[PDB]
Ligand binder design. Structure first.
Ligand SMILES: [Br-]
Lengths: 131, 131
DNA sequence: CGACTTGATGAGATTAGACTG
DNA sequence: CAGTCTAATCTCATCAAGTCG
DNA sequence: CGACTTGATGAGATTAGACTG
DNA sequence: CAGTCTAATCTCATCAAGTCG
């Protein structure tokens, strides 16, 4: 294959500069840049491709639609204590059916005083950890 | 099983509204919304889950790191015409080696008056189209 | 005309060589 | 040394000129 | 103390019901 | 009708409290 080039500091700076003017340059701009900084234009296009590539992937990763968040997370749910009597009953259900529908689910709530919400999270976690 | 909810226009408005206040509400805020608009809080959390999902995938898709170009794209390269004598010679090379390295490539350049730049694209496109 | 052909671009994986901490 | 960087090479898909009956 | 246990969250595929164009 | 939308269900990964000798 071909012999990897090495950019001088002022070569890199010039590229970096033009990339912020527009990152989709036509052959004119590229050709002018190639002469100005002293390197063949095909090399310059391939640098523009990979800078685009790099910046696009790094943005998909880290950027978000909404204006970040200034401060600390809001209050999480305080950890329910599930009683030995509750636990026992939930297990019995889990041994028979591991995917209760809302009918069986809302039934296990009445029997344990837990909210159906938490019944579901219990079976979710239970499945993840005892296949 | 389940049972699909249907949001009233002002329910949706209310959700949409709070989602712009902060999209990661703690259980506290969620509960206040549930009572204010009259539907159990577990449903509100799942709507927030899916709105997040949607806006995040829609942003990964469409948004970009750099300020969009105001106007039209700069000029691409004018299509090189390659003579039958050039083509013929390139074909000869392609039948022997479909992956010339830079040495053979810069050699086909000398022989055709084409730039190695374009030789590379030629073998690229040729392979895509004649396996 | 459209169909077919074939340079030119883009994106997005991939590799391998230099260089660190 | 792995971990990081990034020029260099692919394929794939497609746009945009080109040549056909 | 840490190891081990286990509620609680998020992301991000997946699925299916309602409804269009 | 498929195509769109999106409420509802998953695994998976992980943060954050809890029970232990
Ligand atoms: Br190699």
């Amino acid at each position: 294959r071909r012999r990897r080039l090495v950019w001088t500091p002022s070569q890199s700076e010039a590229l970096r500069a033009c990339f912020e003017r527009n990152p989709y340059p036509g052959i004119a701009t590229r050709e002018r840049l190639a002469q100005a900084i002293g390197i063949p234009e095909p090399r310059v296009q391939i640098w523009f491709q990979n800078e685009r590539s790099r910046q696009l992937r790094q943005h998909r990763r880290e950027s978000r639609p909404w204006p970040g968040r200034r401060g600390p997370p809001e209050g999480r749910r305080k950890r329910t204590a599930v009683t030995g009597s509750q636990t026992a009953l939930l297990l019995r259900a889990f041994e028979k059916d591991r995917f209760p529908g809302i009918a069986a689910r809302e039934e296990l709530a009445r029997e344990t005083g837990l909210p159906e919400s938490r019944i579901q999270i219990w079976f979710q976690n239970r499945r993840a950890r005892h296949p």
